[PDB]
Design an enzyme around this catalytic site. Structure first.
Site, PDB file in Angstrom:
ATOM      1  N   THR A   1      12.712 -17.194  -8.059  1.00 39.21           N
ATOM      2  CA  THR A   1      12.192 -17.808  -9.139  1.00 39.21           C
ATOM      3  C   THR A   1      10.884 -18.785  -8.401  1.00 39.21           C
ATOM      4  O   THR A   1      10.174 -19.258  -9.193  1.00 39.21           O
ATOM      5  CB  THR A   1      12.874 -18.790 -10.113  1.00 39.21           C
TER       6      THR A   1
ATOM      7  N   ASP B   1      -0.955  10.238  -4.425  1.00 36.08           N
ATOM      8  CA  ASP B   1      -1.539   9.484  -3.364  1.00 36.08           C
ATOM      9  C   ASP B   1      -2.139  10.371  -2.348  1.00 36.08           C
ATOM     10  O   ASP B   1      -2.499  11.675  -2.485  1.00 36.08           O
ATOM     11  CB  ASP B   1      -0.884   8.460  -2.734  1.00 36.08           C
TER      12      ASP B   1
ATOM     13  N   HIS C   1      -1.956   5.725   4.003  1.00 30.81           N
ATOM     14  CA  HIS C   1      -1.875   5.028   2.357  1.00 30.81           C
ATOM     15  C   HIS C   1      -0.880   5.429   1.691  1.00 30.81           C
ATOM     16  O   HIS C   1       0.064   4.505   1.363  1.00 30.81           O
ATOM     17  CB  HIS C   1      -3.141   5.189   1.938  1.00 30.81           C
TER      18      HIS C   1
ATOM     19  N   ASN D   1      -9.562  -3.554  -6.550  1.00 30.23           N
ATOM     20  CA  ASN D   1      -9.583  -4.477  -5.626  1.00 30.23           C
ATOM     21  C   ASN D   1     -11.194  -4.937  -5.633  1.00 30.23           C
ATOM     22  O   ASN D   1     -11.901  -5.017  -4.566  1.00 30.23           O
ATOM     23  CB  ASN D   1      -9.329  -3.939  -4.213  1.00 30.23           C
TER      24      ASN D   1
ATOM     25  N   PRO E   1      -4.860   1.286 -21.841  1.00 21.82           N
ATOM     26  CA  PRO E   1      -3.844   0.477 -22.393  1.00 21.82           C
ATOM     27  C   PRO E   1      -2.469   0.586 -22.336  1.00 21.82           C
ATOM     28  O   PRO E   1      -1.267  -0.283 -22.103  1.00 21.82           O
ATOM     29  CB  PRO E   1      -4.085   0.099 -23.745  1.00 21.82           C
TER      30      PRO E   1
ATOM     31  N   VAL F   1      -0.449   2.205 -20.134  1.00 29.74           N
ATOM     32  CA  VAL F   1       0.370   2.211 -19.142  1.00 29.74           C
ATOM     33  C   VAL F   1       0.532   0.801 -18.583  1.00 29.74           C
ATOM     34  O   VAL F   1       0.488  -0.104 -19.390  1.00 29.74           O
ATOM     35  CB  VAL F   1      -0.151   2.936 -17.835  1.00 29.74           C
TER      36      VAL F   1
ATOM     37  N   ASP G   1      -1.138  -5.889 -17.167  1.00 22.45           N
ATOM     38  CA  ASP G   1       0.144  -6.169 -17.741  1.00 22.45           C
ATOM     39  C   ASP G   1       1.237  -7.154 -16.906  1.00 22.45           C
ATOM     40  O   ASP G   1       1.931  -7.860 -17.428  1.00 22.45           O
ATOM     41  CB  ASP G   1       0.914  -4.869 -17.792  1.00 22.45           C
TER      42      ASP G   1
ATOM     43  N   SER H   1      -3.003  -1.518  -4.288  1.00 21.76           N
ATOM     44  CA  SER H   1      -2.422  -0.508  -4.074  1.00 21.76           C
ATOM     45  C   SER H   1      -1.025  -0.972  -3.693  1.00 21.76           C
ATOM     46  O   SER H   1      -0.125  -0.183  -3.550  1.00 21.76           O
ATOM     47  CB  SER H   1      -3.034   0.336  -2.971  1.00 21.76           C
TER      48      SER H   1
ATOM     49  N   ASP I   1       3.727 -19.079 -12.930  1.00 25.71           N
ATOM     50  CA  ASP I   1       3.899 -19.526 -11.386  1.00 25.71           C
ATOM     51  C   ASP I   1       2.570 -19.344 -10.387  1.00 25.71           C
ATOM     52  O   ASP I   1       2.223 -19.881  -9.338  1.00 25.71           O
ATOM     53  CB  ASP I   1       5.006 -18.587 -10.560  1.00 25.71           C
TER      54      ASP I   1
HETATM   55 PR   LIG Z   1      -0.509  -1.997 -20.576  1.00 21.63          PR
HETATM   56 PR   LIG Z   2       8.840 -20.799 -10.921  1.00 24.48          PR
END
Ligand SMILES: [Pr+3]
Ligand SMILES: [Pr+3]
Length: 279
Positions: free
Chosen positions: A16, A39, A69, A161, A175, A177, A200, A224, A260
């Site tokens: 946490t 990939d 990669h 990136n 949207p 995925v 997400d 990635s 966080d």
């Molecule tokens: Pr989504």
């Molecule tokens: Pr926390």
């Protein structure tokens, strides 16, 4: 189970709070699930995969990962030392050449391939696809990602990136995925990570140690690297029976560490992937 002196990203998704060094996880470890890594290929002979990795398709002259990669991303999904889901089955699909680049038509073909191929495999706990790739907006690429998700595969994709809104990138902007941003070990948004309303979830993405070609290891950074953390977490949770391919992204968001992260722009979710493991 507990892995001591783990890579910081693995420790982070089982805590946490930042700053811990132990990865706590259930021994089932994604056994019975399958993850396709779409990939540059996977060095399946790497001892860290323990025989659980296989190339199933290539769109170039060889199925070998000449780049590194894809092997790095696969390692974060499911290698022994560097992976989230340490007992999952890994399937490699080479849509990117050894310079790390690929045509959109080949990427689309690889997605359609996985939607079909999964019907030929034994994956009783479910199927995940990890896409650490992207480029400029394309409705055709987004549509292929949507089809893959609709077919019953949990699709995780990199946000990009560009330190910009992911709405202008594909397949990040689809949207339906699971679009993944990157964080660093101090719970800051990675400086390069895209953002925006279409994200997400965030996962560890800065200074991530994993497998590399030539039986080696390497630390590298990017969305990635964040994406396979979330793909591996989905495989892990599906094996425990906590969620399904259709709802895994939403489940991960609902059970995430909330609030966080720092340097999150207004309108972007402040959610960090978390496995909620209790011994
Ligand atoms: Pr989504
Ligand atoms: Pr926390």
């Amino acid at each position: 189970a507990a892995q001591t002196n783990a890579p910081w990203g693995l420790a982070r998704i089982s805590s946490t709070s930042p700053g811990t060094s132990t990865y706590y996880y259930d021994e089932s470890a994604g056994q019975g699930s399958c993850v396709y890594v779409i990939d540059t290929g996977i060095e399946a002979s790497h001892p860290e995969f323990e025989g659980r990795a296989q190339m199933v398709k290539t769109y170039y002259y060889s199925s070998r990962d000449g780049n590194g990669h894809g092997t790095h991303c696969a390692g974060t999904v499911g290698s022994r030392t560097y992976g989230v889901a340490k007992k999952t089955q890994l399937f490699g699909v080479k849509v990117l050449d050894d310079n790390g680049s690929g045509q959109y038509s080949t990427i689309i073909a690889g997605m359609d391939f996985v939607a079909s191929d999964k019907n030929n495999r034994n994956c009783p706990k479910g199927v995940v696809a990890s896409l650490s790739l992207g480029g400029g907006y394309s409705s055709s690429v987004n549509s292929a990602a949507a089809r893959l998700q609709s077919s019953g595969v949990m699709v995780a994709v990199a946000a990009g990136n560009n330190n910009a809104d992911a709405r202008n990138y594909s397949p990040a902007s689809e949207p339906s995925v699971c679009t993944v941003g990157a964080s660093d070990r101090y719970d800051r948004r990675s400086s390069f990570s895209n953002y925006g309303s279409v994200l997400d979830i965030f996962g560890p993405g800065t200074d991530i140690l994993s497998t590399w070609i030539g039986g080696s290891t390497r630390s590298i950074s990017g969305t990635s690297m964040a994406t396979p953390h979330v793909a591996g977490l989905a495989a892990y949770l599906m094996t425990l029976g906590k969620t399904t391919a259709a709802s895994a992204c939403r489940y991960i968001a609902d059970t995430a560490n909330k609030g966080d992260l720092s340097n999150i722009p207004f309108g972007t979710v402040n959610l960090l992937a978390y496995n909620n493991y209790q011994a």
